[PDB]
């Protein structure tokens, strides 16, 4: 089965069935302009989230997709981002592995 929760509150965010092989792997190692290296896991579906701010294509790690920040809908923890703007798929979620916790139903 297997699902992914907000590590700060237990909120259910997504699950393994929903991983999306972007580029060929669901996991991307990236860094940002702050010099922080995350591991980002890509889902085609997520629930339990609140999106914040405007879509933005600056700094995007993924070609043709703008991002908006995704917060845990329950606790406000920054779980990662929602991506929109592209084709096959149009939108998807890029979530910071470290901020989730993977366990069972
Ligand atoms: O696709 C993305 C999501 C946004 C993400 N991001 C951050 O992790 C960051 C940290 C500090 C300043 C600016 C940003 C930025 O745009 C980033 O670098 N790429
Ligand atoms: Zn939470």
């Amino acid at each position: 089965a297997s699902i992914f929760r907000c590590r700060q509150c237990g909120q259910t965010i997504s699950r393994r069935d929903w991983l999306l092989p972007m580029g060929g792997d669901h996991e991307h190692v990236v860094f940002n302009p702050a010099g922080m290296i995350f591991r980002v896991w890509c889902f085609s579906l997520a629930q339990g989230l609140r999106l914040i701010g405007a879509p933005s294509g600056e700094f995007s790690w993924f070609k043709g997709y703008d991002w908006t920040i995704a917060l845990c809908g329950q606790c406000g923890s920054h779980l990662g981002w929602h991506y929109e703007g592209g084709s096959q798929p149009q939108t998807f979620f890029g979530l910071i592995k470290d901020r989730l916790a993977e366990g069972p139903a």
Side-chain angles (χ1 to χ4, degrees), residues 15-87 89-92:
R15 38 157 78 156
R16 190 158 276 276
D17 287 89
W18 297 343
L19 282 158
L20 184 52
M22 204 70 53
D25 197 348
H26 67 270
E27 180 176 77
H28 292 256
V29 190
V30 311
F31 57 92
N32 66 12
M36 208 61 252
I37 102 183
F38 317 100
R39 289 179 145 79
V40 173
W41 284 31
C42 296
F43 301 84
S44 47
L45 264 28
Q47 262 142 6
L49 297 163
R50 188 157 61 91
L51 304 187
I52 249 303
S56 323
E58 333 112 43
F59 313 119
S60 184
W61 298 301
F62 302 96
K63 249 153 271 133
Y65 289 101
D66 293 344
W67 51 264
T68 113
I69 288 165
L71 305 185
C72 175
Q74 198 276 344
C75 76
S77 172
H78 184 214
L79 303 192
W81 313 257
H82 179 248
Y83 291 91
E84 81 211 59
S87 252
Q90 274 174 177
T91 84
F92 73 91

Side-chain angles (χ1 to χ4, degrees), residues 5-13 48-49 71-79 99:
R5 302 175 148 108
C6 181
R7 205 207 267 307
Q8 231 39 22
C9 75
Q11 174 105 296
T12 283
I13 303 308
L49 297 163
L71 305 185
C72 175
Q74 198 276 344
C75 76
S77 172
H78 184 214
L79 303 192
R99 314 286 245 266

